[PDB]
Design a protein around this ligand. Structure first.
Ligand SMILES: Nc1ncnc2c1ncn2[C@@H]1O[C@H](COP(=O)(O)OP(=O)(O)OP(=O)(O)O)[C@@H](O)[C@H]1O
Ligand SMILES: Nc1ncnc2c1ncn2[C@@H]1O[C@H](COP(=O)(O)OP(=O)(O)OP(=O)(O)O)[C@@H](O)[C@H]1O
Ligand SMILES: Nc1ncnc2c1ncn2[C@@H]1O[C@H](COP(=O)(O)OP(=O)(O)OP(=O)(O)O)[C@@H](O)[C@H]1O
Ligand SMILES: Nc1ncnc2c1ncn2[C@@H]1O[C@H](COP(=O)(O)OP(=O)(O)OP(=O)(O)O)[C@@H](O)[C@H]1O
Ligand SMILES: Nc1ncnc2c1ncn2[C@@H]1O[C@H](COP(=O)(O)OP(=O)(O)OP(=O)(O)O)[C@@H](O)[C@H]1O
Ligand code: MOO
Ligand code: MOO
Ligand SMILES: [Mg+2]
Ligand SMILES: [Mg+2]
Ligand SMILES: [Mg+2]
Ligand SMILES: [Mg+2]
Lengths: 272, 267, 267, 272, 55
């Protein structure tokens, strides 16, 4: 009488919660959409330094375009810290702060794209990244974007601080697209045992290589989100991520070529 | 005398003065004559946080019961950071404007999240958001302040700083929609002779005109100077009032027409 | 008997007549049955300016208190200019439609600026603007009549002129949302035997059906003829009324159901 | 006093209903905007079969890109049938159902574009197609889109089923753009006298060639809309349309090359 | 005959990837007449005509 009108399919009459019923259909490893893509996440602490750090970076990128097809995703930086301070004084929840920071990321991206426009580079907004990325890259060589993912009012709770930030969004994109590599650019040589700008600066040991697990089990600060370490475990394509200092010329160029100039983070992926 | 106007419009160029004079002789129509526009400073108010925003939220939910309110937000210091960055890079005023628009929108979003429980929304389409204003249980909206001149901004004579920022956005929105009152809520009792935060000898100014304001040769002002040239050229709104939003009640008293801060008159 | 419908839908093609017959046997839901649609001509009314628009604004602000109104705008003579230009170039009907949509949107913007003080907004979303159509404080919306077939417009048998314009947009919006009546406000008392502006012997017509209307072999009509084939094929709205908006009260009387001008019936 | 303010033009003071007054201005044949364009409408019944039918099709298209400039429009399929089932149970009118089906078309298109992204292909929304298809095709070679036309809440009445569906929209586009050819891809060799998947499949006889009139004056089902025939009657540029089976490799390629591998439908156009 | 053809081709380029191969025509007939008066063999005439094609 009021029975359900079903569309015949393997997943019909399912809730998608029982893995024993979805595995025969969705339990297989996916494919790479843009396996020829290279993703570069610029940190906001870099862009906040201004010309001193951007102009060299811009020249490096200018020299990289003919070598790679690039998606350059920017981060927020300190303006996001300010908007957090305010929104917390007001008592706003994390889902209300997330977009406010995504915006600072987008503005940094607009800046960078303005500096690179002479070379055919421009900023896309994120709908376009999701859908119309291949064509925007068949036209030109690089495009700029925001790294913060659109979890704006749907941000996960638990913390008053949006856990899903730039690093996380960049990785999620890259692993979805099945990209060739993800490269993170920070204001430090890489990852240490402790903040080399903090009080424990003296006990900081550089980590040339490590795994997402060794860090996630650890405690202490990081130049990258921890949600990144959580999603890495569920990765499908990306096997390693290199963190490099962009204040130092040539390290980004090398990293895109697979050289070990900073910190290497192995994901949970098993190679062939 | 509209036939002459029409034949001129179809024949002459819009630079034809006969045409401009014919047009000036046309009618005037106020779209929101019962509405009041206020500008919440970002650097002066919102960037202070709770202490300065919660009281104003109270004042606003109180006042909307007797006045229509168009609350424009300012950008703040994040915008100044962005401007510093982009100027260090040598990027032009249009870009900086694109950037500050966003800060103003963030602040508006925050304020709207504060006010949603009171039925006050955030609207892009502020002027023709007719419904919320036709109602007495809403009777107000938040329209981020920065104008749409994003990459087409008129640059200043010297520099890349956009001269037409939030102040101008709010004021022009008022003048267009024929609003009755234009108020600037900031961190000072009004206009002085100099920035009191830097010069404690500065003298208060309760009332002044634009001409006198220029004659004083102010190095710094509480408003963007271009707003003055705009005010001298407006037709509906001929005066604005600047008040302190940290002082409780000042805004409510001003909405009632009372003179509590500084009043700036075109003539 | 929905199981047969479902199995057919899943198996047969939508051209299957058994399926079409099953579907026709389905229910009928009216989305805005209490709503009335009216179309304000552009060339006939708005392009006349003040004298023809202010009175209508009054009538509308008056009628919304007892009726629920969806006011679609027409395009006017700017559209005819555009059509002439684009046809001189040989550009197809879809482009011309893209162009006229804009003229209809401009006129809507103007009307909405006139009506905003009365709480009547301009809506892209006429059918699902549930709030204004619900509040007696508003009970009306202004949309723009030109339909969305922008480039996919069905061309006419001969020429590049889009046959489905503002008239059709408004009528189809009515038929979809199951509105109760559909009115066309124009510059004539109704339909005649010929264009009275050209011919002086043109005879009035108070009432007629679509079949009789075609039999008369009219060279020119006050409505787009395709609207007739649509009306003959509709389900909810089976008649429309054409009236003169220059005559005061005609619109108000029509909304009450009176026979003011011409009435066109599918059957 | 209240006279009309006219803009001087040939069509001034006209209603555009009197053909004797518009013919001197708009009575001539239009031009082709994208005469170098090839349009391909994939049916949804094809995409509903999944990989088994899509992967071969994807490889064929991959091999076609360097040969043609392609606009690949997709149809809806069975999900549209389900949403019709529901909306009719609810009593919704045809204008309410049209967009709900256009959406399933768009999703099929997003799928296909995801499968083809590695080659520079992307999905473009109805306004992009309309206003700016030429640039999106100067960048890359093919773009994907939805075939359902945007008559969403303004669909024609008379039937509780939207008559203007994918086939119709594809044809309307192609004939507006003055495209080189329109090619339809179905799950059957072409058009028959009856549904070969139905009860009278034994009497179904293949039709290698026919005219829009012969079909429109007939009665019975079709793999294509009837509104398609009605618009064919009023076409301006397109002279023939080929219906081909996409489950069979090589037929789409041939059809794009003008071969007669399926059913040919002549329009009302009179060539020179 | 060439200008119309050239315009047609100009309109075909964005539609196809084209290899346009030309033929010789009448000049080849002349060089044949000559070479045959001289008694040259066909292998001596072939390139002489290929050249008119190339031109
Ligand atoms: N274990 C660590 N190793 C290295 N750097 C650290 C560590 N812990 C903290 N840091 C510090 O964290 C800073 C970066 O913080 P964060 O990652 O928030 O900025 P960002 O990533 O550049 O900007 P965004 O977060 O907007 O991308 C670095 O300047 C670094 O000094
Ligand atoms: N002549 C003056 N009289 C009064 N205040 C002045 C004067 N000159 C400078 N100021 C200072 O200018 C500040 C307000 O300008 P500012 O633009 O920083 O704030 P705002 O305009 O409210 O914020 P935003 O610019 O982000 O909208 C006040 O804090 C005030 O101290
Ligand atoms: N048989 C007729 N009966 C009445 N009016 C007619 C007839 N034939 C032509 N007309 C003319 O058609 C005109 C209305 O059509 P027109 O399209 O010009 O105006 P409109 O439809 O209101 O404007 P728009 O087309 O911009 O919406 C009237 O001014 C009228 O003079
Ligand atoms: N006369 C006919 N000749 C051939 N096939 C027919 C005929 N009548 C019905 N069909 C059937 O119609 C089916 C296609 O239905 P339909 O056209 O709705 O699907 P589609 O066009 O592939 O999808 P969409 O409508 O979303 O584009 C075919 O699978 C075919 O079996
Ligand atoms: N059976 C035939 N049908 C049609 N044309 C013929 C036939 N026999 C001879 N001709 C003539 O042959 C001529 C073409 O000769 P030929 O093929 O040598 O020239 P071409 O091919 O244009 O030049 P080239 O040989 O350098 O490519 C035509 O002009 C035509 O009149
Ligand atoms: O801080 Mo402002 O509002 O950009 O001048
Ligand atoms: O003037 Mo129109 O384009 O017939 O509504
Ligand atoms: Mg569920
Ligand atoms: Mg970091
Ligand atoms: Mg008309
Ligand atoms: Mg079909």
């Amino acid at each position: 009488t009021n029975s359900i009108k079903h569309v015949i399919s393997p997943l019909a009459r399912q809730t998608l919660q029982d893995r024993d019923l979805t595995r025969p259909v969705a339990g297989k490893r996916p494919i790479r959409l843009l396996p020829w893509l290279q993703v570069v996440k610029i940190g906001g602490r870099v862009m906040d330094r201004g010309a001193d750090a951007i102009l060299p970076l811009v020249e490096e990128l200018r020299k990289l375009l003919p070598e790679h097809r690039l998606l350059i995703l920017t981060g927020a930086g300190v303006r996001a810290r300010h908007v957090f301070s305010v929104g917390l004084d007001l008592g706003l929840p994390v889902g209300s702060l997330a977009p406010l920071a995504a915006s600072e990321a987008g503005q940094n991206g607009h800046i960078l794209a303005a500096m690179l426009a002479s070379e055919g580079v421009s900023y896309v907004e994120h709908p376009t990244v999701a859908d119309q990325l291949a064509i925007h890259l068949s036209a030109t060589r690089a495009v700029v974007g925001s790294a913060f993912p659109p979890y704006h009012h749907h941000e996960f709770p638990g913390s008053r601080i949006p856990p899903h930030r730039a690093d996380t969004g960049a990785f999620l994109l890259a692993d979805a697209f099945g990209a060739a590599g993800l490269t993170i650019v920070e204001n430090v040589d890489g990852i240490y045992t402790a903040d080399p700008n903090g009080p424990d600066r003296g006990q900081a040991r550089f980590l040339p290589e490590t795994s997402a697990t060794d860090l996630a089990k650890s405690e202490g600060p990081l130049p990258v989100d921890r949600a990144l370490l959580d999603v890495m475990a569920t990765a499908r394509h990306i096997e390693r991520v290199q963190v490099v200092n962009g204040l130092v010329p040539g390290r980004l160029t090398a990293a895109l070529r697979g050289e070990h100039v900073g910190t290497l983070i192995r994901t949970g992926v098993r190679p062939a | 005398s509209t036939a002459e106007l029409e034949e001129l419009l179809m024949q002459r160029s819009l630079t034809d003065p006969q045409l401009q004079a014919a047009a000036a002789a046309a009618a005037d129509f106020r779209i929101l004559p019962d509405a009041t526009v206020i500008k919440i400073g970002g650097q002066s108010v919102i960037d202070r946080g709770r202490a300065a925003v919660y009281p104003l939220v109270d004042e606003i939910v109180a006042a909307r019961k007797n006045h229509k309110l168009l609350i424009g937000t300012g950008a703040g210091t994040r915008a100044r950071h962005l401007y510093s960055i982009a100027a260090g890079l040598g990027l032009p005023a249009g870009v900086l404007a694109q950037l500050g628009s966003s800060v103003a929108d963030q602040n508006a979003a925050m304020l709207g999240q504060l006010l949603a429980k009171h039925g006050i929304p955030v609207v892009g389409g502020a002027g023709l958001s007719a419904v919320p204003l036709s109602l007495a249980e809403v009777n107000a909206v938040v329209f981020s302040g920065m104008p749409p001149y994003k990459l087409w901004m008129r640059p200043a004579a010297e520099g890349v700083i956009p001269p037409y920022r939030t102040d101008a956005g709010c004021f022009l929105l008022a003048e267009q929609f024929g609003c009755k009152q234009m108020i600037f809520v900031k961190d000072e009792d009004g206009l002085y002779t100099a920035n009191p935060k830097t010069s404690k000898d500065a003298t208060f100014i309760p009332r002044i005109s634009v001409d006198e304001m220029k004659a004083k040769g102010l190095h710094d002002s509480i408003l963007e100077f271009p707003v003055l040239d705009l005010l001298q050229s407006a037709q509906h709104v001929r005066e604005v009032q600047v008040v302190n939003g940290l002082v409780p009640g000042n805004l409510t008293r001003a909405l009632a027409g009372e003179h509590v801060g500084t009043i700036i008159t075109a003539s």
